[PDB]
Design a protein around this ligand. Structure first.
Ligand SMILES: NC(=O)C1=CN([C@@H]2O[C@H](COP(=O)(O)OP(=O)(O)OC[C@H]3O[C@@H](n4cnc5c(N)ncnc54)[C@H](O)[C@@H]3O)[C@@H](O)[C@H]2O)C=CC1
Ligand SMILES: NC(=O)C1=CN([C@@H]2O[C@H](COP(=O)(O)OP(=O)(O)OC[C@H]3O[C@@H](n4cnc5c(N)ncnc54)[C@H](O)[C@@H]3O)[C@@H](O)[C@H]2O)C=CC1
Ligand SMILES: NC(=O)C1=CN([C@@H]2O[C@H](COP(=O)(O)OP(=O)(O)OC[C@H]3O[C@@H](n4cnc5c(N)ncnc54)[C@H](O)[C@@H]3O)[C@@H](O)[C@H]2O)C=CC1
Ligand SMILES: O=C([O-])C(O)C(=O)[O-]
Ligand SMILES: O=C([O-])C(O)C(=O)[O-]
Ligand SMILES: O=C([O-])C(O)C(=O)[O-]
Lengths: 602, 602, 592
């Protein structure tokens, strides 16, 4: 136990001022002792350390004998996990092993994932998760998510379902109806793995407390005929509901979630069908603490890559011309975000649009097109119609070429060459996923520009070595933005998340790109830096939000950075046993304080 | 179970519009099913209904056989309780029976207390609770409060103690160091019953959810020699600590409470020593969601009585002159509140004070006094010194006479007569407690004014019948204010509670005084009306707070009154079993959705 | 938490040989750590030590802050309790305080009762419990018993009620239908306090583990018209059911209990109307581990008194003559036991029954009886019908006079004098309760005898000084017998309890009577010696039952006494935190 003149768990601390010490004690995480013991404790992923439990811990908590007689450090445990991970036959098996690890030892799970982020991120989420949902179907595991269906349509029915969730302090919810699992399509009730994986990244990359995360899948049916014909499908066996009923379920959902966990609850939409996703974002953006990563996150991270490029083309975003090959959800969202960013730079919206050109399956979007998307009206160009990328390039001489059109290798030598003729350092972004759909590989962009192109892709490409100069092409991964935006939003209870905040996040990502990477053609920070980037984003959001009074956390913490750093998740094992401490010796004595004569009996 | 086209627990409802229905479903309380069963459930006061449990409930929840084979309604149960209550030998025994009832069946406890508020309020709190703490010492009961001592001085040590409290959703805390238990003095660690009783009123009179309440007693020692010599004292056996250490404990306390339950947590100070209480209020008022009932509540409820009087003397508060016999904590607080109220009426602070005269043990407080309290500086009168109430009356001809000086019968016939000569309807308030210390009884005030005096007292006096005209003198009970102020503060997350809000509460109490009572000389509403008054106060506070942006609940509820009425505690027994409901018949079927050929075995 | 070469909780152990050490470790109680914390733990009487918890315990268990900042010793807590107990207005008030204590801190409850047995036994049970049930009605308390009614009449329905009981390891059950609460009568559902108090004594006086105890009240209705008319009554509001349905409810009860806890479960019947008491005993006695204290405990504790008396009259029971004034349940049961005791001493059931004379409202029970009770037939004497005890005395010349007839002063000077005439040390027992109904007081028994009378009563009488000699009359309290019989039965899983076992318990109590107590006319041991007596009875029972093969505990423990002493309840607080111990250093290291 601790001495009467000492505080609990305050040993071997760095020298601190009387003021610093107080601020440290105010912000620091306090020990939380569990109620569970023995097997029940070992079966709780948030408490279980496995063989990482010392002998004394095992005896005190009633775990002794239920675990093998070997004792390990978290590091030795992570070694065992990574070793077995790499011995796995394929990525799907690694996904299964990792999902199991999350259900076994949560601290270890994040330790391992954070330590090998570049190697494991594409397993936890990115592209393997969708493949796992499609191929495995119902995956055996601990209840780590909720299914809310069109047959539980009411605030009360949804409330009762949320009430079945173990944790009461839910602050982050990622929901999907499973209609547009990125790169796979409609997988219905099998899409539960998407919210799960997304939240795993909120924790691993953002620092968001795992107990605050709640993955949700809304089941209104599926239009995937293979599933409706599949005798092993476990979702509602009917086509997707879409009338007022669907809109009612979503309304009742947002209500129930906020009625249950509070209006400040962050609800993020993931993998909805493009049109539906945009509609929902427009309806809830200003009513709840919500955002859609596919729309706003994508737009944001690309703008971050472009902002970084600025430092090389020496031309501001408002001083550049952009050509998008493809004008669907991604391109349109990105373009709009670029417009906002240009306005915040001084230019008018009118002139902002003028520097943006859109091409779609029909060709260049011109003011004289039959029936175009409303969101394209302000980008339509007063120029001659064409289907030639080269003709559009020569006419507008853009400084940046961005492809978000599922067309493989549409950025051929002639196109690349063209760009590397009108520009000293051409910006080429091949965003279509996976790499097999990339408008062009990194190798092609550098070779056909003599290594002068500023390239970024949706899917990761190997390093390139041309004439001595080495190139490390970067990925425009949403993971650079959403974790930090989620963290800042949660910790400070930001009421609503708007473009300005995503722009702020994008500017922050750009500012973290080092010179050592910029000299290697890298316009994105290294993935292992997202945790730090996330914290920096969270603090920046606080500053911005307190100024316009949108942060609800009251009062503003005296030291934003310290508060945030004390709030983020710690992958290190913690003590589960209460700390003991002395009271002044005379006050801990047992027995009458004042003597009396003992009673007599029979 | 409910039909597939119906919602859970939505039967036999009043006709509702499509809009009304939605608002009802949004605000209404949702069913919460317990995890405990059998004896463990029966031992939880918030779940236990006792023999009020039906046979089906007892069988389902594993209670059957653990209770007698008799079934009752809550009404029949309340009858049994009230009957036994009145058969009790004295009030202390009733206090013990009621404390036990609170630990047995919480719903019943509040049912009984709310039904017989006038008869039971003085048992639960008011004057019996202090007597019980003094005479019984350690009272056997379920852990219904927390002890935080000077030896648990640190945010972490206090945090760990709060972590031992069962409920996590704490929103209301009433704390005392037990130094000034009203009318009894320093009772040290025995004062725990004060916060307990105060919170019981928050629930019964304000409607505050009982699970949000947390009673706390800070133990830094006691200066009561009888206790330090008592071999049965259970508190720290030393005199009260008072240096920076005491101030540190209180600071660490406010920090830990907010760090644990949130900055919006309402912490109310009760029964601290007058000077200490005022100091603490000044230090925390603007830093936390805190207030002191003894100071602000007292000042407030008296102002409410005076405001009501206005409707009879036809003279506004800013058009009246007040004379206080006694100038300690009560009188000074009341006077200051009257000053604020007069300013809000148009008059200047300078002129406001001019209408207020203070007399203390030395006599009239004049500008030419040796060493007077700072808070008296602005009330000191530029007039001749004297010790005669009659001389001061004749000189200022006040319209209201307020006594807050422990001197029994100091308002004698001559004094009363004087008042009923300068004024048609003299305002006489005898606030000293108990009745045995009252500056004058109601009977004396009416008799010596021919029944024209506007009388109110700190302690309740019987009804008076003079020359046909019946009189029902009222009590200036704090209970008219604090419940509603607490309710509004909690439900809307008001950041800070200032004079303006107490004034608003006082104006609301005044507005509820009916004509039927005003004709009987009653300047206070009937106690049984506090629940309704509390709700009206809560709503009014919301309106006021949303206008100046001090209410943190976001967003402002569409219907303030409905939101509040759906939030208040309901003394009626609730269902503890999950409501069941149908899904479309085809969706609830068990078995392969699509046929397959059965496998073969050996 | 402990060195790699040490065993957990084994410090300060008395010197022991390798074998003694082994047997000690084998029999000793092991620590049991609870799962509850904070208020939940504080709300469990079996765990809660209240302010007796040390500061470290409170911190570790999450109790800190929930208790006042004072630390006490158990002795200190017991003092606080006795003070308030003696400050109570009356015994009923002490009953309520004690009931609350058992619901608050179980170890303390038993520490207090055990420390002041003579003072508190009559509050816990004896005469106060019945009056509390009658006067208070449905008293507020933690669930501490089960109510099984005529409406839960099936093995499954009763099984589900038992399943609602917390403890799974129930081994002793005391049940009453509340029709005949001693001294008060039919109290219906209000009679649940009787089984509760009875079990409290099982623990306090017998050393029976508290977790094994289950109080039960069978509610089949009540004939008490006041209760039926009392709007506050909480039992079934209708007259008692007695047909086949009652018998079936009792059969299903016995079935359900044994199915739930096992055939080894001791089920003791208490305060049943005399007819049902005897019938049920006869029916279940050899089919279950069952017995009825009112019948067997009474007969046994009285035979124990008569046995101690043979030590002064130099006349073995088989060499004695007994006259019972009153021949109801009590007298008849005692007679049957005495007879059984006589048969075991060599005599035949011929002489035995011929050595016992009965009397009732209609005087002596003679062979010339019109419609006499079946159980009396073998005692009915073939002699002239009388009504005067004196005439019977002079005729049969009894060495002992036993009264179990609700008639006060039945034994007048004449009657007593006549006994002190025929016998040097006449045996006079006034068993009617309360004292206001005793056949005669001690003062009377001694005075009108010169102090030569071997007296005992059912209720307590103060010490009496005659001719400079102080007399201390004893009480034939069932508490000397049932705790021990229960302990032995439970511990060694004895299949059935029969006369021989009660007789064995009777002989043990008799043997613990010191010479000094005997010189003071006391024919029963001191109330404070019951815990020790119970342990001795259990050991004696095991020996007897292992010999005739009726003890199911297998195998016979090596040292019966050491075994029993390791099983009995301990009132001292125990550790609730796991003991920790080292492993070889090389084997606790973390990492590769
Ligand atoms: N979170 C996300 O949703 C992200 C998606 N991406 C990638 O962006 C790509 C596009 O996604 P979406 O905008 O949602 O699809 P989309 O269906 O909304 O838009 C595709 C656009 O490309 C045009 N297009 C198709 N074939 C063409 C051709 N031969 N020539 C010229 N224009 C053509 C279409 O007319 C349409 O405007 C995908 O490959 C996706 O993997 C990249 C980053 C993030
Ligand atoms: N929550 C509360 O604390 C409430 C208290 N009260 C009652 O108000 C009374 C006063 O309370 P406090 O202000 O806290 O006491 P206090 O000690 O703070 O003030 C008493 C005042 O009366 C004066 N005084 C004393 N004897 C006098 C005499 N013979 N002649 C003229 N002036 C005299 C003193 O100098 C002092 O100014 C008490 O009887 C109390 O029960 C009433 C309502 C609420
Ligand atoms: N556990 C127990 O039940 C114990 C009971 N007792 C006491 O034994 C006494 C009798 O109990 P029970 O046998 O159960 O009642 P009972 O009704 O079964 O027996 C009473 C007997 O006394 C006879 N009797 C009544 N008035 C008489 C009179 N004037 N003259 C002669 N004979 C008369 C009756 O005819 C009947 O045979 C009670 O006072 C009881 O408190 C003593 C020890 C234990
Ligand atoms: O074996 C493992 O996977 C690891 O060491 C663990 O303890 O979980
Ligand atoms: O008896 C009572 O006090 C009441 O009926 C209850 O059930 O608690
Ligand atoms: O006061 C008491 O009754 C005793 O000290 C206890 O802790 O229960």
């Amino acid at each position: 136990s601790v001495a009467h003149h000492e505080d609990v768990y305050s040993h071997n601390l760095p020298p601190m001022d009387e003021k610093e010490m107080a601020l440290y004690k105010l912000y620091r995480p306090e020990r939380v002792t569990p109620k569970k013991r023995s097997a029940e404790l070992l079966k709780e992923p948030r408490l279980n350390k496995g063989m990482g439990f010392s002998l004394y811990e095992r005896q005190y908590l009633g775990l002794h004998g239920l675990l093998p007689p070997a004792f390990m450090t978290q590091e030795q445990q992570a070694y065992r996990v990574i070793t077995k991970l790499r011995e796995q036959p394929n990525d799907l098996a690694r996904y299964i092993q990792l999902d199991g690890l999350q259900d076994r030892n949560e601290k270890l799970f994040y330790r391992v994932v954070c330590d090998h982020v570049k190697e494991l991120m594409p397993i936890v989420y990115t592209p393997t998760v969708g493949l796992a949902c499609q191929n495995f179907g119902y995956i055996y595991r601990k209840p780590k998510g909720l299914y809310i269906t069109i047959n539980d349509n009411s605030v009360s029915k949804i409330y009762q379902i949320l009430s079945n969730w173990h944790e009461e302090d839910v602050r982050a919810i990622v929901v999907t109806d499973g209609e547009r699992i990125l790169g796979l399509g409609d997988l219905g009730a099998y899409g539960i793995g998407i919210p799960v994986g997304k939240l795993a990244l909120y924790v691993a990359l953002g620092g968001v407390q795992p107990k605050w995360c709640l993955p949700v899948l809304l089941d209104v049916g599926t239009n995937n005929m293979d599933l409706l014909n599949d005798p092993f499908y476990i979702g509602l066996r009917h086509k997707r509901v879409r009338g007022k009923d669907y809109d009612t379920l979503l309304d009742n959902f947002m209500k129930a979630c906020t009625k249950k966990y509070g209006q400040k609850t962050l609800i993020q939409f993931e993998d909805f069908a493009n049109p539906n996703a945009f509609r929902l974002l427009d309806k809830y953006q200003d009513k709840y603490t919500m955002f859609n990563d596919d729309i706003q996150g994508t737009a944001s991270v690309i703008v971050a890559g472009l902002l970084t490029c600025t430092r090389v083309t020496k031309k501001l975003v408002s001083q550049e011309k952009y050509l998008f090959f493809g004008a669907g959800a991604a391109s349109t969202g990105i373009a709009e975000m670029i417009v906002h960013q240009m306005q915040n730079e001084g230019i008018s919206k009118e002139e902002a649009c003028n520097r943006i050109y859109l091409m779609d399956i029909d060709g260049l979007v011109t003011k004289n097109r039959k029936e175009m998307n409303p969101r394209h009206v302000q980008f339509a160009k007063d120029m001659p119609e064409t289907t030639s990328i080269l003709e559009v390039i020569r006419a507008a001489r853009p400084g940046a070429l961005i492809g978000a059109s599922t067309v493989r290798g549409a950025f051929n030598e002639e196109v690349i060459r063209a760009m590397a003729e009108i520009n000293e350092r051409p910006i080429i972004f091949a965003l279509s996923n996976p790499t097999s759909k990339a408008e062009c590989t990194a190798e092609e962009a550098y070779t056909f520009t003599n290594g002068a192109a500023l390239y970024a892709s949706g899917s990761p490409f190997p390093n390139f070595e041309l004439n001595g100069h080495t190139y490390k092409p970067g990925q425009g991964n949403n993971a650079y933005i959403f974790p930090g935006v989620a963290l800042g939003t949660i910790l400070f209870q930001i009421r609503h998340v708007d473009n300005d905040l995503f722009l702020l996040a994008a500017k922050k990502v750009a500012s973290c790109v080092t010179e050592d990477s910029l000299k290697v053609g890298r316009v994105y920070p290294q993935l292992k830096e997202i945790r730090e980037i996330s914290i920096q984003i969270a603090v920046e959001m606080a500053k911005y939000c307190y100024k316009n009074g949108t942060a609800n956390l009251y009062p503003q913490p005296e030291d934003l950075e310290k508060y945030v750093r004390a709030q983020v998740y710690n992958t290190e094992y913690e003590e589960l046993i209460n700390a003991t401490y002395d009271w002044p010796e005379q006050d801990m004595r047992h027995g009458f304080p004042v003597p009396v004569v003992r009673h007599d009996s029979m």
